[PDB]
Symmetry: C3
Subunit: 114 residues, 3 copies
Amino acid sequence: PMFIVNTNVPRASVPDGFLSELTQQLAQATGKPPQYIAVHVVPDQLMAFGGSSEPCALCSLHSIGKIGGAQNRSYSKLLCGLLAERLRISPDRVYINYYDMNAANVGWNNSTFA
Amino acid sequence: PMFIVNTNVPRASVPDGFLSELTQQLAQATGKPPQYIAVHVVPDQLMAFGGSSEPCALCSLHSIGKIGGAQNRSYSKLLCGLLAERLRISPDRVYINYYDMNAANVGWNNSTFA
Amino acid sequence: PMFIVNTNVPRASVPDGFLSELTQQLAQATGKPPQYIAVHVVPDQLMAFGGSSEPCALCSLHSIGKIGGAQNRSYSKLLCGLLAERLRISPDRVYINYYDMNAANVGWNNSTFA
């Protein structure tokens, strides 16, 4: 799985352990080994949500399977919780786009997963 | 809706109110309330279009509905126009990817829109 | 086609001419003229892969057609090879997401390809 967070919070406010915390929590939530999880955090962005530049986040989660109606509601609770606690972002200023990837459409280690 | 602009134009050339303008224009074009519109502008990027590093942009628009043949032409005229007027990017050096998102695949405030 | 590379390798390690090389190699691999290829390289990113911050990359390739099972294997060998040779990134620390875009969902030059 790969998880991307784009946010206007400054780099100095991103805790040093945040990428490792996300990796472990996503491994538990998805049931996948941590070795397969990639995380990308992009702070200091020029962003607005609802016309306001108060802290916000635009996120994406891509996974081969483990995406769906009930699962995505659970992921949204987990991730809004982490963003609220660690980055101080209000949960109504977070969007998360979920992508169920076909194995033939994910490249890794010179090949694809198909 | 969520609109992202990645561009090699320098940050100093982005006008002060550009995020507000995009928000209002997108609200009018999509018919969705400004409260739910997120905009993200990423300048100073290392980009090329057709092998050249003249000003260019790669953009994405994600929406739950309001995506389709005729609507997307209208959005492209609006958005290429704004980027040409405000950032001085030629419209033939802009790509905009459009994504019709399933409501179950957009997380917000501890749930999804399904 | 549009190709995006996000990496934690520093900007100073990106060779002169890399965006040209990517444009030329992707034109050959996809069969599309170079004029319609856009490339975007994002170094110095805060990223982890498998809970480690050793060099890694998250990439996307979006094309109108020319995406599929066997083609994506060929692209992954090509692109993992280039990232390994030019940026010193191990292929097992690269994900590439492939997107087959409908022509009606790509805006360019004030219109769409539909």
